[PDB]
């Protein structure tokens, strides 16, 4: 028969930390537990690698179970960055693969040009010789005379004369023009992206004792690479400019498509979302562990997200770790910081 009230029943409930509260069959006892949800498992590897700072296993895990081709590069980039170390990595990644004449016989000053310049010389007038030279297409000579004096302004009035009509008909001429005038702006902004490992050396070469500038330029290049098909490479430049923000931004934009390729792989909306945010977080953690680097909203936003998935695993310890790394300026960060505390404490 049916009855209005008081029937016996477990009266089950879920609570923070993934705990299940129910009533014993005797109807007089309460039982709290942490059920085993196939598919959900506290992240040990992350907790253990984050402490022993040895992501060899973690990296070896993601690598052996990677998703799409691109993802594989990133973990490989991290697999090798793991062994060789940051410094040693950026090395292997930014490097590369007649005199005499004896005069003979009679000769003579033919022409006015020659005679005028010759007279100048002997008459110890090294300055005029060059003027008379330049005002004729005797640049080769003008240069030879100048390559003999000390006078800088003169020893330079010719360079600016060479470039004046050649730096535009020769790529090597335009490059010299830049090496000469101690600059990179030109290469960094117009030299073909394919020869980046070069524009790379022109930054470390011209700014060897001014890091702020060295990195402002390296960055300016990375952006250009990534925006012109050199994704893998722009990351290398960023890794050397210490701009985790750029790498973060790229990865946050690549997030969606990544969660989609996972959802098509026979996974529930949750398995996909779950798996995705985890891969991104482990990929970001290991990467931030080798570079020289939170103020990015979405990153924070998604950081908070991984927190909850972690608390739900009961692993309050790994949850706090990420809680710490977030700006204690954010209230959501504040609240969860407090909640995780009591929940565990």
């Amino acid at each position: 028969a049916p009855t209005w009230y008081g029937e016996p029943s477990p009266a089950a409930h879920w609570a923070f930390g993934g705990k299940l509260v129910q009533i014993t069959p005797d109807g007089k006892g309460v039982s709290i537990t942490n059920p085993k949800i196939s598919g959900l498992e506290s992240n040990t590897t992350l907790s253990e690698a984050l402490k022993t700072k040895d992501f060899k296993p973690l990296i070896n895990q993601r690598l052996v179970k990677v998703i799409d081709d691109v993802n594989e590069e990133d973990w490989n980039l991290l697999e090798k960055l793991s062994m060789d170390g940051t410094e040693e990595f950026l090395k292997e990644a930014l490097a590369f693969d007649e005199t005499n004449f004896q005069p003979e016989g009679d000769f003579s000053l033919s022409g006015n040009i020659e005679q005028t310049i010759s007279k100048n010389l002997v008459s110890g007038n090294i300055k005029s010789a060059v003027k008379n030279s330049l005002e004729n297409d005797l640049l080769m000579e003008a240069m030879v005379i100048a390559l003999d004096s000390n006078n800088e302004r003169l020893k330079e009035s010719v360079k600016n004369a060479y470039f004046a009509k050649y730096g535009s008909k020769s790529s090597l001429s335009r490059i010299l023009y830049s090496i000469s005038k101690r600059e990179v702006d030109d290469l960094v902004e117009n030299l073909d992206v394919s020869q980046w490992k070069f524009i790379s050396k022109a930054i470390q070469n011209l700014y060897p004792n001014d890091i702020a500038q060295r990195n402002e330029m390296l960055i300016k290049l990375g952006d250009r690479l990534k925006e012109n098909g050199h994704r893998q490479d722009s990351l290398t430049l960023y890794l050397a400019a210490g701009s985790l923000d750029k790498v973060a931004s790229i990865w946050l934009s690549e997030f969606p498509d990544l969660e989609d390729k996972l959802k098509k792989d026979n996974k529930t909306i949750y398995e996909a979302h779950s798996e995705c945010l985890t891969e991104f977080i482990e990929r970001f953690t290991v990467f931030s562990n080798f570079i020289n680097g939170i103020n990015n909203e979405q990153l924070i936003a998604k950081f908070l997200e991984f927190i909850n998935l972690t608390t739900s695993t009961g692993n309050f310890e790994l949850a706090t770790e990420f809680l710490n790394s977030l700006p204690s300026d954010n209230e959501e960060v504040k609240t969860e910081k407090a909640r995780v505390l009591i929940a565990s404490g």
Binding site: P2, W4, Y5, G6, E7, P8, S9, P10, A11, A12, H13, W14, A15, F16, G17, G18, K19, L20, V21, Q22, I23, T24, P25, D26, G27, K28, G29, V30, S31, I32, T33, P35, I37, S38, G39, L40, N266, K267, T268, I269, Y270, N308, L309, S312, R339, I342, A343
Partner: protein, 279 residues
């Protein structure tokens, strides 16, 4: 972790608070008990007294209001409780129904300190606690025969689902040009009293409802979006052994905890197909 003999009379509700560390029970003895569980230990902390009849349910409020607990009983009233300075005391009392109150539930902390109440008198009440203390609620006739449960929808525009003894499940939405919650949809699908209704807090596009009934079946109601209707999906093709009495969603993972009459608890999750299976 087990806390045997928390009461001598049969227990009807046990809920952990926002931190899932502070337990609370209620039963026929007409009392509530506060516990503190750790590893596999426990310590009673108090015994709430006042209800003139068996206590049916309890709901912990969001910490941002203080340390409160709400309860309802066959006595047709609702009592709020507080733990200020280290001791529990009946702050307020809500009693506008003329029959057993069977469920009570604190709205989302964004709405403020609101309480959702359902009674065998067929009505449902919405209660806030004024600046001064007293209460000026919303009372609506929501089911014939009697209302057994009511749950709040997550926050965005405010909705809640009720489950009556008229076998119906019902969604409610607040309306301005009425200053009341109006009936948005009636979902037919049970052939016997609906015992409980739970609105999942999942933040995915799709909304999930789970209703449990005297007919030995659980139904998961889902709605793709505002233009979609509520689609019925039995938890499993075969009926269950006994009456399903409760439904509870985890906070993450959207995992359903079903409490049967054969005093057995089954766990479920959704799969690629959109059909449930043991999690």
């Amino acid at each position: 972790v087990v806390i045997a003999n928390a009461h001598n009379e049969l227990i009807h509700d046990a809920v952990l608070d926002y931190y899932g560390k502070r337990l609370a029970t209620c039963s026929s003895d007409k009392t509530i008990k506060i516990f503190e569980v750790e590893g596999e230990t426990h310590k009673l902390i108090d015994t709430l007294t006042g209800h003139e009849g068996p206590v049916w349910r309890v709901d912990w409020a969001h910490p941002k209001f203080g340390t409160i607990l709400a309860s309802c009983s066959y006595d047709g009233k609702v009592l709020i409780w507080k733990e200020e300075n280290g001791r529990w005391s009946q702050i307020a009392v809500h009693a506008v129904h003329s029959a057993s109150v069977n469920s009570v539930q604190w709205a989302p902390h964004e709405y403020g300190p609101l309480l959702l109440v359902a009674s065998s008198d067929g009505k449902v009440s919405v209660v806030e606690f004024k600046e001064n203390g007293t209460t000026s609620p919303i009372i609506i006739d929501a089911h014939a025969i009697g209302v057994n449960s009511a749950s709040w929808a997550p926050a965005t525009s405010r909705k809640f689902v009720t489950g009556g003894a008229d076998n119906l499940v019902k969604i409610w939405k607040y309306n301005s040009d009425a200053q009341t919650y109006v009936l948005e949809s009636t979902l037919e699908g049970h052939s016997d009293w609906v015992r409980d209704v739970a609105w999942s807090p999942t933040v995915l596009l799709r909304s999930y409802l789970a209703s449990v009934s005297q007919d030995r079946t659980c139904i998961i109601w889902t709605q793709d979006n505002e233009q979609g209707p509520w689609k019925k999906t039995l938890l499993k093709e075969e009926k269950f052994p006994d009456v399903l009495w409760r439904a509870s969603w985890s906070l993450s993972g959207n995992v359903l905890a079903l409490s049967g009459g054969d005093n057995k608890v089954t766990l479920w999750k959704e799969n690629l197909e959109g059909k449930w299976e043991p999690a």
